[PDB]
Design a binder for this molecule. Structure first.
Ligand SMILES: CCCc1c(C)c2cc3c(C)c(C)oc3cc2oc1=O
Ligand SMILES: CCCc1c(C)c2cc3c(C)c(C)oc3cc2oc1=O
Ligand SMILES: CCCc1c(C)c2cc3c(C)c(C)oc3cc2oc1=O
Ligand code: NA
Ligand code: NA
Ligand code: NA
Ligand code: NA
Lengths: 494, 494, 494, 494
């Protein structure tokens, strides 16, 4: 029961947002944002650079000064503002989903029913946290009263990616604002429009000026500016492992700002022979192909036990072959385009690599349309651990299927990676689920499901998939600076 | 690795313990404690009554005064004291286990390896909590700083049963002492000796006088005095459901003291047809027969899926027929005597009740030895929900085996009880484990195990099996009084 | 900014609310509710008795069945419903505030700006808790995985008093519903109407039928039936200490339901010689007289240090004499009538005891109008600890002012009471504040303020002022039943 | 009550500790460690470099393998090991205190009564946390059961400073081992010997081999190797702000290991005009001179309200003049030597700089003794914010005394710094202390006291003074990796 989209949604916001006001870049440069379903330019957007980030940080700092409206506001009132922001987003849901689909390429039905649903839920979840993150009173030795205050960390630099433009904005704003921080946010050049529209609702909701500032631009310029800024207290980055290291180096080279990273993965999806075949096939398909394959936690190594391999592979192929590729505003479409030309070409290179290193191509392998960045659902069978397509993050609709004999073997293979963002196990057996969920080196382990996210449950990487956790209570930790206050008292009693 | 016991351990402590001194009853009365293995008097113990409780409460109240050594002691030091106590009990481990067996009847090997081990673990666990149970600092609206102090509830009456004399003493002393309370402890007339020796160790560990006071005697007299006392702040009772009511009526009739209760149960042990047969037979046997059936959480309704029933019964009978009943100091003995004549006769009543109401007697059903309170391990087949042996807590070596068809049916029948202490589920299937553990109305659900206790995990009843929780962090809640302090400040900032 | 009241609000709801429908009593009997400003009947209300409680409990029990819409509903959606209810209340704010003043007597300006502000805040606060009250995963010994579920306690009987009818309704509904419980609510015969109207809003917000049921009626009939009901899992009562005993006895005599109580107090308000005089005089006035003195936590023993006594008394008298008694719908009115004839007579009774016992009547001391239950603001000086008005809860606009010299003296005098609901301290000295806030035996200690409530901060009694805490995270504890699940695993690793 | 020291204690441990075994450096090189009281060599110590770190990491990694004794051990038993370690350190307390004094120069009385005490308290505190740092069960939407496991982060590299060798070792081993990690620890070349002896006790206590590995050596070699290592999951460094940047940079350049840092300070100690003069003078003295000025949180900016400036200066000069410098083994000694020649000359440099830039030199100013590294207690007055000595960390017995007028001014001036480790306020006024403890940008704010540490209370920096916290529950956060497990279930109910 999805409302009919406007397939040519109008763009109202394409500038830099600072102090609840719209501005051009100081250079007056703009960049085009493109519709990946057509290859056509949608509009021009302000191209922020170091000097625009400088202005945004100054605006954030000012708003975070002791005595300011943002600092004096009751914590419960921060929750109200987040709940108001959610209501505005809900009022404008049809428009935002359409705009998300236009700029990013994901099917409108999914923008509406998944992304926007999850945005609303995430904001509403964190509105609740705003007055509930207690400090502690602490029974220290000797004649003293000691306690902790959980203070906001301060000016927070947030660099968000293009695969889930609205959801990620919500994942970062939720906890930051619940805890009384202020943000300078950098949106991805491939997908800036929805985040900018949401800035207009942030103003309408009544957040004071300078609390949220949004700088669209490029990574090497506006992103690096944030990571290296001397008055930014904390940086959160979501993107590639490679860029992650730049961020963390830049933090240590500048002011030792605090860092959390959500990086890549090559997540294992392990199907035991006693799994429910029909359910597992459908979920392995979803686990890989969701969002045109553009998910950090994609199930891009599907380990299948040897006794069910052939049937599993067969069913996986048939499902991949029926997957509808097309216009994302068409209700029948399961698969839209890749986000841009760079990704397009990058995925085709990996497909080529897979053919050439002797992975067996079971379907797809090519370009699915003459217009836009559409790639055919592709499945490789008999994939080996040493192959490049088994090791590196493809970020496309390319499925790898590997075969294994034993549970002890599959654990070592699944864990033999520098990535550990997610994993999954499919089995009816209690003991096997418990053994594997314990043994897997991943920040999230799904059992008999995949890509089950909830605002309540934390998410993040082991190893080089990242550091720190987003979502849940855990997502608050990185946005909080702890202060101990220890007071001499006449005589301590229990 | 169990050291050879003294089968006639000497008694050193048989008096009332108040302010680190030993007192006779004001009446000079004494009562005999009996060895249930022989029917013979071990020795005589001071019979505390109302006037001796009153003296205890006064001592306790004095040790609890503001400025007193106990109230001023660093939280961390209460933990040192709990740890020292544990060290003293470990030194005297062999003696305490022998004394427990003599007075209570359980096999020495179990007293040594289970009870005493858990005692040590419990006190060591709670020693660690002493300086970690934080209050909160709270982001209240307006120009205020609000926070909570977790203060001790005060004078705690604690009424400890005879089935696990040492371990229950530890379950109560642990959280009480770690949070800075003082205690007046009433120990069971059937099994007072071990608790009194432990008081000597409390003295030797260095606890200030009045912090722990112990008054042996009878229920209607000493127990009632504590429950009705106008200067006891809290009462903790473990016993029958019937006496539980007497305690809560007395609390409400006197000074609205806080009440926690650990009462009886008719805990269902559910065996699905896909369970591991041998493991489930040995665990169901343990579940019911452990401690001569004298566990509040005994698995006394063994529900078995109809397709495995004949076999499950056949094996359970064989195992029960082989259970060795005898002298609890003999290392080959699995089953000691019941704790006293009253229980002995109560169990024989229930056994005859079962035969009379059409349950099928598969083995046992009579008296095991000519002397002592020994009962043959007994198994009833074909038991129905409507029978009294399927409803009422028997508290003896009597196993009920019921038959069932579906998982929906068995949930309804398992939950159709006024008891809800514990339950268990035996299955290899992940979905059945999770469905049942969510649906069963029980404070503990064990999956593929039974009677697994840890100091870290709470334990307590649903419904009329009690209220409140022992063990874990949860065990501290009932021993804490929460004070909110809200202070006007010049200007609140986040 | 207060909208003009409707001084003759229409009454819509006056029946028993069960399964989202309106019912007459089975008996067809009704009782009058009176306007305490005029002494005249507002309307007839259905008079719930035992049979009506039995219907409500049945309906709640069915709504709590496993698999029902309320049990299956997402925790986050419970939060949404509460926020919905809050929105609907905000919509009808002006009305409900007027209706409260009509039936209860409190000034409309306070109904609007305080009572209804706090209702919204409470509900919004608890909406935030619905999906955040986590259980624990627990590092138990052995090859086991252990964790806790925080489940709803079940059918909750909630008896709410007449002094804050809407607010108390919120305080109890908030936590109960946030944690997934179902409710049978008994509202006060003096003030039933606002709670019945909110029932209609509960229906409009989309709460499933049976989740909230309201039975208006009398204490010894409807109240006693809930406290004694064999299928009510939990009872929460706010009212007199004496009736709290009836409740706690009823619980023990029936099914050992869980019990929390908010009872009376005789709360000390302590003014040091270094207090800011004007601030302390104005707050001490508020502390006693707020809500016509009908607060459980009223500052009804104003201890004042000898050096500032004369001046403090002079200023408190002037302020009391200026206090405007009258029509609660007139904006200049600070004090409306007491709630009914019984209280009215009882308060005059205490005033007379104070005059006869040799307390110094400084102002007021008689009736203030011929119609309704208006009483003169009354202040007694040179009060002694042994006088009746110093010992007993008056629940009227009657101030006692005691004199003290030392900080050691006043602690002992303040703590010399069977009550311990609240207390306060006014001082500019850090160490005095800390000394007194530690030493006072009260659930809430205000420093340089009074009657500062926040949904975030717990509130409740020491001693005979009650057991359990309402508000904050603490408020959830009594509405939660803890289940431990412990599962055998192949091999535990850290 | 301090035992007489052995003033020439024997050295037993001077090699690399890996797998519970003593090894020479692969290079066979050694470096001297010197007695800073005499300037003379105590012994030679194995000089670890990259190759030795590589071996330590490999042993740690092996010790951390799934299925290993350390991984399989009950969490509670980790606590037992820690408590055993503490008992061993308490057995060897007299020796360790003397050895600490030999190698580091702090007075033996302080080594025995403060450092070793605090070591014992820290280890015993963290022994309590080993089985109490629970993960969570989470009420996620839809038909799922979601929970978190708090797993160990893995191989932890710990780089510890020379100013508190034993204490810092305890601060890092405590939480690391409590939470099941394994460690590679680099001790400072100035003070390796006490940590090496402790390793011997770690073996004795029964920790499995590879759990703790200790590599003495130089920073640019061994330290850098740990920060750069591809298989080190986490690095904790305490030392200079400058070197902290090198560590962060190294972590980002290698494997994105997690990082916590405890760096420098220039902590303000603010004396209001209503402060207790004598207490304040003695505590300001303590704040600065404790441990020969060698504290990261030294109160090296003493801000003194103008009306009490001349009196406070006079009394602070007198007390500084009375400070006894000399042999640390002499019980009359308040102040031993600086740790080495480098620090010695560095402090002389800063002194000269304070003379040059117009600070008024009120006592001291030079070398107290050149046999060993002794400096005169030095006190500078009329210090301005812009002076080098008012900005840079001196780490020596040199006091800066500044003058201020208003509370608003001093906040601006105290916060105007790139450091934020600690702060203090001396006042009797409640409002001033509450205003200042909120407004100061520092990790710990002491009120009417200074250098009050408790293992229960977190410690760590704001701004460039560090990131993350040590001690308390918060100290566990950095040693935990969070895993979410989300499971599909048949039907979710509350
Ligand atoms: C209030 C609970 C009383 C009770 C305890 C303490 C208890 C302990 C253990 C231990 C330890 C094993 C192995 O089995 C038990 C059974 C048990 O049954 C019980 O009824
Ligand atoms: C069970 C407690 C009943 C009670 C409430 C709810 C109460 C609320 C408020 C508010 C709101 C202000 C400003 O003062 C109060 C006093 C109050 O005194 C009370 O006794
Ligand atoms: C990174 C923290 C280093 C540091 C410690 C550990 C420290 C401990 C104590 C104790 C214990 C007293 C009495 O004063 C101290 C000062 C201190 O100053 C310091 O800079
Ligand atoms: Na685009
Ligand atoms: Na006995
Ligand atoms: Na009325
Ligand atoms: Na040295």
């Amino acid at each position: 029961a999805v409302p009919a989209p406007n397939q040519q949604p109008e763009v109202f916001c394409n500038q830099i947002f600072i102090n609840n006001e719209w501005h051009d870049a100081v250079s007056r440069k703009t960049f085009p944002t493109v519709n990946p379903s057509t290859g056509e330019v949608i509009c021009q957007v302000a191209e922020g650079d170091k000097e625009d980030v400088d202005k945004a940080v100054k605006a954030a700092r000012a708003a975070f000064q002791l005595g300011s409206p943002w600092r004096r506001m009751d914590a419960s009132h921060r929750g109200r503002l987040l709940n108001r922001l959610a209501d505005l987003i809900e009022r404008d849901r049809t428009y935002l989903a359409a705009l998300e689909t236009l700029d990013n390429g994901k099917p409108y039905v999914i923008s509406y029913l998944v992304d926007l649903d999850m945005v609303l839920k995430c904001l509403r979840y964190y509105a609740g946290w705003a007055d509930k993150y207690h400090g502690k009173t602490i029974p220290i030795d000797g004649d003293f009263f000691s306690y902790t205050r959980h203070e906001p960390v301060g000016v927070c630099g947030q660099i968000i990616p293009w695969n889930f433009p609205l959801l990620m904005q919500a994942w970062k704003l939720g906890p930051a604002l619940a805890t009384g921080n202020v943000v300078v946010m950098k949106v991805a050049e491939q997908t800036p429009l929805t985040a900018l529209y949401v800035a207009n609702l942030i103003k309408e909701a009544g957040f004071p000026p300078g609390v949220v500032n949004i700088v669209p631009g490029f990574g090497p310029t506006a992103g690096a500016a944030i990571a290296s800024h001397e008055d930014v207290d904390k940086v959160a980055f979501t993107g590639s492992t490679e860029i992650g290291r730049v961020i963390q180096v830049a933090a240590g080279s500048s002011n030792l700002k605090r860092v959390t990273l959500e990086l890549g993965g090559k997540s294992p999806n392990i199907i035991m022979s006693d799994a429910d075949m029909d359910w597992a096939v459908e979920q392995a398909h979803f686990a890989l192909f969701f969002n045109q394959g553009q998910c950090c936690c994609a199930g891009s190594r599907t380990f299948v036990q040897e006794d069910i391999y052939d049937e599993f592979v067969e069913r996986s192929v048939a499902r991949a072959k029926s997957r509808v590729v097309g216009n994302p505003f068409d209700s029948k479409t399961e698969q839209g385009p890749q986000v841009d030309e760079t990704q397009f070409k990058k995925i085709l290179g990996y497909i080529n690599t897979g053919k050439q290193e002797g992975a067996k191509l079971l379907c797809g392998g090519g370009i699915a349309a003459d217009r836009g960045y559409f790639i055919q659902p592709t499945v490789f069978g008999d994939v080996q651990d040493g192959m490049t397509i088994a090791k590196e993050e493809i970020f496309g609709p390319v499925m790898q299927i590997l075969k294994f004999k034993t549970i002890e073997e599959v654990v070592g293979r699944a864990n033999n990676s520098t990535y550990g963002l997610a994993a999954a196990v499919f089995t009816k057996d209690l003991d096997k689920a418990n053994y594997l969920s314990q043994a897997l080196q991943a920040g999230t382990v799904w059992v008999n499901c995949y890509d089950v996210f909830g605002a309540q449950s934390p998410f993040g990487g082991y190893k080089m998939s990242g550091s720190g956790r987003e979502l849940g209570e855990y997502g608050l930790q990185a946005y909080t600076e702890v202060k101990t206050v220890t007071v001499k008292v006449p005589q301590k009693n229990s």
